[PDB]
Amino acid sequence: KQTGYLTIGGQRYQAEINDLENLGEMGGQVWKMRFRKTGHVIAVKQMRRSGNKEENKRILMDLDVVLKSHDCPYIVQCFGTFITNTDVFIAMELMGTCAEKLKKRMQGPIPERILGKMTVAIVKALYYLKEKHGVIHRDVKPSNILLDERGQIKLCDFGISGRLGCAAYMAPERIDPPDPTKPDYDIRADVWSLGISLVELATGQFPYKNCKTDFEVLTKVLQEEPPLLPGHMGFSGDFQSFVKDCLTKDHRKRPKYNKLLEHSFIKRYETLEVDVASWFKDVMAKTESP
């Protein structure tokens, strides 16, 4: 009724409503709140018992994954849940923004060094989901890639439980498949989506911006060469090779995450020191919101 529990930084706290400052909306119903006992600002989501049955099923399936992903550094964490007679309140790690909004703020390219660190994190998150929990994400795109002012990069909880349109990020083998009732693709389609995401964020241009309809984009995916990084922006050979491998059109030759994690681009950005935190803070201070 009056007391819940938040676990943050390996410590459990009692939390009554007086311990939390409502700081308003995030960019479903979710509030930014500051926990006065620690200074953390967290996200609190409300799932109403009377809510839409599909939206609630999605929230519960995503939460179930988040709860059992406490050992993955690259997935947003849950700090607690509070159940009342009429509602469920879910306390989540609050990130600063997604990569889609970051591109919009940047009005252009995001630097390769940031994208390298992003790639490492997001591949490891997707690989973790598949290996540990059997989850094929199926919706890899910039809006699901989160960053914060601590320099962390993490996969969003939304849809983290997988399937249970984005023609833009659809792999060729997903376009006119034999049985879309039994859509039996694997993680390689998400590898393609990651590649498209990286080109979009690196160039500040979605590779199919000039298309006027969803069907048009699918024609381009099939008919055109893969939309590789351009050569006029100073991208490393490693980055260019990584994106080329992700955007292998024939899925039978497209690498899986385990192979991608061996790639020179990933090994490089594992060791390179990149101050993502300071960079992110600079962006957020020089730019406006939506």
Ligand X SMILES: C=CC(=O)N1CCC[C@@H](n2nc(-c3ccc(Oc4ccccc4)cc3)c3c(N)ncnc32)C1
We find the least distance from the C-beta atom of residue 225 to ligand X, in angstroms, to be 49
Q: Which residues are marked as active site? A: 139
81/241 with CB nearer ligand X: 81
Q: Closer to ligand X at the Cβ: 15 or 94?
A: 15
**Whether 145 contacts 99, CB under 8 Å:** yes
CA atoms of 15 and 36, how far apart (whole Å): 9
Pick 6 or 140: Cβ nearer ligand X:
6
At its nearest, how many Å lie between ligand X and the CB of residue 111? 36
The rounded Cα 66 to chain-centroid distance in angstroms is 13
| Min dist. Cβ of residue 9 to ligand X (A) | 15
Compare residues 82 and 185 and give the one whose CB is closer to ligand X.
82
Residue 9 in marked binding region: no
Where residue 204 falls (left for φ over 0; alpha for ψ -120 to 50; beta otherwise) is left
At residue 25, the 3 state secondary structure works out as strand
Task: Enumerate residues 225-244 that contact ligand X by CB under 6 A.
Answer: none
CB-wise, 44 or 122, nearer to ligand X?
44
Please classify residue 40 by burial: count the beta carbons closer than 10 Å to its beta carbon, then call 0-12 exposed, 13-18 middle and 19+ buried. middle
- Indicate whether 95 belongs to the interface with ligand X (CB under 6 A): no
Nearest distance from C-beta of residue 36 to ligand X, angstroms: 11
26 is in an annotated binding site: yes
Q: Which stretch binds ligand X (CB under 6 A): 12-20, 53-61, 98-106, 217-225?
A: 12-20
Stretch that binds ligand X, among 2-10, 107-115, 141-149, 190-198 (CB under 6 A): 2-10
Using CB under 6 A as the binding rule, the residues of this chain from 29 to 88 that contact ligand X are 31, 33, 44, 46, 80-82, 84
CA distances from 249 to 171, 207, 225, 254, 256 (A): 8, 15, 8, 7, 13
Indicate left, alpha or beta for 53 from its phi (over 0: left) and psi (-120 to 50: alpha).
Answer: alpha
29 is in an annotated binding site: yes
Phi and psi at residue 215, in whole multiples of 5°? -60, -45
Rg (CA), the chain: 20
Residue reference for tokens 């009692």: 14
Distance CA 139, CA 108 (A): 23
Q: Are strands 30-35 and 41-48 parallel, antiparallel or unpaired?
A: antiparallel
The minimum distance between CB 219 and ligand X, in angstroms, equals 46
CA–CA dist 258, 167 (Å, integer): 26
Asked if residue 15 binds ligand X (CB under 6 A), the reply is yes
Beta bridge partners of 274: none
The residues binding ligand X (CB under 6 A) are 4-6, 15, 17, 20, 22, 31, 33, 44, 46, 80-82, 84, 89, 91
Binding-site residue positions for ATP = 26-30, 45
Binding-site residue positions = 26-30, 45
